[PDB]
Nucleic acid binder design. Sequence first.
RNA 1: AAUUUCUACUGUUGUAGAUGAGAAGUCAUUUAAUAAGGCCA
DNA 2: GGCCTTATTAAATGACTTCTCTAACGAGCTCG
DNA 3: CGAGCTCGTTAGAGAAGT
Length: 1298
Amino acid sequence: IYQEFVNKYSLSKTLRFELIPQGKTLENIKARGLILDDEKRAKDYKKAKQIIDKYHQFFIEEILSSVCISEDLLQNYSDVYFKLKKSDDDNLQKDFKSAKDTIKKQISEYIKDSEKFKNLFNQNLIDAKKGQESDLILWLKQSKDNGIELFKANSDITDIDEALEIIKSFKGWTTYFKGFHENRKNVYSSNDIPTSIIYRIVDDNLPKFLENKAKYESLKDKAPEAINYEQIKKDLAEELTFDIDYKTSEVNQRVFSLDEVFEIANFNNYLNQSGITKFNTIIGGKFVNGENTKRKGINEYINLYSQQINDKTLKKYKMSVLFKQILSDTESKSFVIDKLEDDSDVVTTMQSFYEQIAAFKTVEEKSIKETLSLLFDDLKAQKLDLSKIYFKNDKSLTDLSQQVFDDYSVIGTAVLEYITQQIAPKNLDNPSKKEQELIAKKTEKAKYLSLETIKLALEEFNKHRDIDKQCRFEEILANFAAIPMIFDEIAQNKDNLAQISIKYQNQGKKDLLQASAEDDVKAIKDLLDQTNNLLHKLKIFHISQSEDKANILDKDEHFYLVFEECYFELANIVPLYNKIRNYITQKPYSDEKFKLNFENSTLANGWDKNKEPDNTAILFIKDDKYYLGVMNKKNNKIFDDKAIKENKGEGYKKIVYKLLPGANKMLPKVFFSAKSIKFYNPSEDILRIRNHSTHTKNGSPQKGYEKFEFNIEDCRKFIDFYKQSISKHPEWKDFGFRFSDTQRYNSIDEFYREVENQGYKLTFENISESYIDSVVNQGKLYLFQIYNKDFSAYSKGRPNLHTLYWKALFDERNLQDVVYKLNGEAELFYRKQSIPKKITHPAKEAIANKNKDNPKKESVFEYDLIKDKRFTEDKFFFHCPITINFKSSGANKFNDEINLLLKEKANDVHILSIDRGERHLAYYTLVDGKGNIIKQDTFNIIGNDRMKTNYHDKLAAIEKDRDSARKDWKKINNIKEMKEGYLSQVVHEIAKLVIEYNAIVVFQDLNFGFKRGRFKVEKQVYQKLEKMLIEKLNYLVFKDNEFDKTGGVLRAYQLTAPFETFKKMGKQTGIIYYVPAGFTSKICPVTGFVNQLYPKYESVSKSQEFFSKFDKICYNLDKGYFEFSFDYKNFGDKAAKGKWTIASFGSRLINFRNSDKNHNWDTREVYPTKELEKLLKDYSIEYGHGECIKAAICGESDKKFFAKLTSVLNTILQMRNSKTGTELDYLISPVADVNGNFFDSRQAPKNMPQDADANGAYHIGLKGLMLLGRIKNNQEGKKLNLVIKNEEYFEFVQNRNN
RNA sequence: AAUUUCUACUGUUGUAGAUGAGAAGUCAUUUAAUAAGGCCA
DNA sequence: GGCCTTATTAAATGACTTCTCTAACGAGCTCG
DNA sequence: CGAGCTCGTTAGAGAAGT
Ligand SMILES: [Mg+2]
Ligand SMILES: [Mg+2]
Ligand SMILES: [Mg+2]
Ligand SMILES: [Mg+2]
């Protein structure tokens, strides 16, 4: 089993705890004000990360725009990029790695050739030194305040007179930023990290520009349509300026053209953010002010030719927009809307609109309401001619169809039955071989279908109706007579909300977005949608000024000096509905769990004894209780070597901590020091090895020297030379190494570990209890208690894991050989109060339970039970890192150790396998090493202890609440915590099965192209069961198992590779194999049949060729069902060997019919056998003899016959069915090669799948079962072939039992 | 309806499982409004 | 009355990929 | 005008890898 597989690689956690202020430390903290001046150092510290990240926005516009013109190296990259995608053994990446790095070393040459890069990451930024004004407060002071710039106009920072004060108040707090200046050494890294601006250009925006021009010279090919470069280039001209061409020299302000935009030499203008919001506006498009329509772009002009002209494959020249530049305040060029700030807008902006609608009198003396009851009433008495009245055949007409007529296809199929008889004769002049498109035939797409073409065409529509009183023109004509009644539903609903537009008329309230207004937003929202939906019923008469070539439609008489004057006021629900929707939908700002300083920039950066007057944080132990003492700033030497001797008594075991961090960085820090090199005495040759870097393979040389070779002829150099004195330091003589010895020791990596593996000492020194209480009462120590609900007295049973780790830091089983090394840089926090004090369950009165299996219905409870006591209290927290498996950290070549484990521990290893999705969120199936499954249950109902709750319906209830919250502007409730708490039940249920049944759990692949658009489902546990199973078998401790035994707390299970990324993961994360998607669910389990046919009814003549390919299509005399018994060798794409005998004995099912419109409303049911006997009754083909009846089927040609028999073959092949109840939708197998009795999974035994989704996990665990067959026979061909192609997969499934 | 935190609980000032935190950056998605379009037994 | 496409804007959530898990020396400093 | 003092800084291996 997995029992020799503990202590494999180091890890890290962060144990959280509460800190209870003991004694009068809470009296001392709140006396000075060490929390009231600490929410002013996380609210006034994130301001100084928005001032330093705005000096990086006047350095990232100088490292990419003003310099960095990487010319003609681009073509050397582009030649080896497109060539690389075809085929590559080992050569095409040699030039590709060279062409990648050579572009980077010109971007990262202005890294080390600028003045603003050394004085950017240290003290010289904020406050440099006495006598020097520092480069960030110099950049802000004279260049901005005395210059002309106001660039703090978009923040919570007011101006720049105030923004110097945030920076200057961190004087002395420069090492507080040492984790922020390591996130700005990542923006400029010349390495393969995605935070870098040299990865954003070379590995994001450049290959997304090579394929962005390879899909444009293939767009001049195959498609020269009317893309914008015919006349329409007044639109995208302000974003085609490009003040310097990069095929030639400078050109002042000429408008570029699309030929010299996708030139490879002009990528060097697509570097900064001002030239990516000037390239995505090419591809995307933009809106303007005083607009009529949209200014389109190349990925929109391809849409209007792809679908509008033909049936298409031109969608796949969809050109990507380029990713933004790191740290960049992006621009739009697309009219961002003037978003509002508080609640005094939403009841004044919304209030001033309906003041202007209901109380507007024109210069022609009318109102908006009494000129649709007066002007659309003139449509009844025909006072206006019905030919200058125009609909708009895009959607407002077809929306008017199934609003008046209860059918969409009335006005559509009444001009269809009018254009074929009136404007066209019965001569049938070119029906198909003509235009039939938007140019000559569809003259009403962009143009306006007249009501004169509706008046005497609906009158012609009723000439062939069934009943007499049917749909005709005066029902359309009287709807718009009833449209100014919605004018009276608004402005009476607005007078209805006169009492809730006054409970929010106060500036800066910001309360409509609270959940206390969740039922009053509903009154504000549904007053907008009585105006939004009103102005989709006047979007039928709208003349959009997009005038075509002299095709001015004649329409003037009292219908557009009237309608477009009153539609012009009511069209302001573009700037009313979105200034409000974007304000309500935002979450309200919760309070912060800010970080505790106690006036110390290095608070608990280290626990070491030598640094405690600098760190000021000590740990204690008193009777299995743990204590956090934080010394005062002023009184920091109150635990020195003197005060422990004068107070050595009985009580708090104070913790003595010894640490040697970074033996690469530390042993040549003190030995080769510029203070005490004379004491360690390096020889004449050691002092140049640290210069020439001979002791390293790839280590840096000291300045002014050159890297020599590690192991040319001196691999045995450092053994007898570079090993001098660790046992001469005053403190560090505690090690006892496994010294070099010329035979027993490799390179300098294996010494700097054995320093750090042994450079950790934890010892205990008693302090008398009367002294600790004396400094706490005085003000010289802030003692807290590290409290975790298992350190309480009432802890009956098993504790947590983040308690059973913390007890195991300070143990004595631990410190014999350290597994649980405590770390530094721990954080202290203070979460304020969130939930109010409402008791809701008072004393001693009974409370009804929530379990029907529970042999109890009430509970007494002498004490109260407030709702959330976590959040009714102002708490102190303590995030504390650990470094589990400390002296073992080999995290490399992990997966070959498992593939050598499973090569020996085969025939005893089972295959867990999980299907994600919606019908089952997960579905394990413990398939053993022969196929015959053992356990099988959904992970929908989980928690087998005493509850058995159903999270599949809990998560679906959040989806239907989240999606309702988005569409009702309610608060979107976070589904990730319910899903984290659901999966914790699953993972533990997995983790028990991994050890009890020896699993090698295998998922479906789900390439990231799938799961991006599978985020439509919100209950789906894609990416999330696997990420919470890799990091949960990285360290798998069993609370039942004995402390220091195999799966215990010291020795715990490590069964995944260390989770670095998914990118360098592949298809083996330890034991978490992946298998690729497709053809897992649709397979008969007992035989192995698949859906390798695809009838679609393309033509009629080749349909005769389709049903001639079968071997025989016969009725069975002996039993009574049809057969389509064939072989697949006589078919097109990929022949799978096997003679299939598919049948129609099983009664198949649901075909997904459609009631009024399409896309999966309802279901059906049809039997296959009794559907084609009807078809052998409609035609003269008989079947009583029982032989080959193939030739009779191919003879009788019909439009009906070969469009129906394929649609029955698209139903016998449909195996996943069995709706109408949605109760474990089973499978029917056609072939059944065993005895002819089919596989119907309702009547399935224990060791077969039970529904359709149990057949996915039976085959994810079956293509993942031949992974375990390769590994069982794997050898010196170490190229581990985990990728499978379904040519042997289909071979292995079918030939299983044999 | 009690938690370092989350989920389910009453298991009785708690019970069972899980818990890698901080910071920075980006990306993906959903919904809505808008724009131009396509299709339907 | 539905479904889908290409975009743009705004709001949300979810989730990826990087850095760190540090004691000791040396300026730089106030003080004498 | 050197005493320590005290915070910003400095020291700077090594291996696998859609
Ligand atoms: Mg440039
Ligand atoms: Mg316990
Ligand atoms: Mg527990
Ligand atoms: Mg709960």
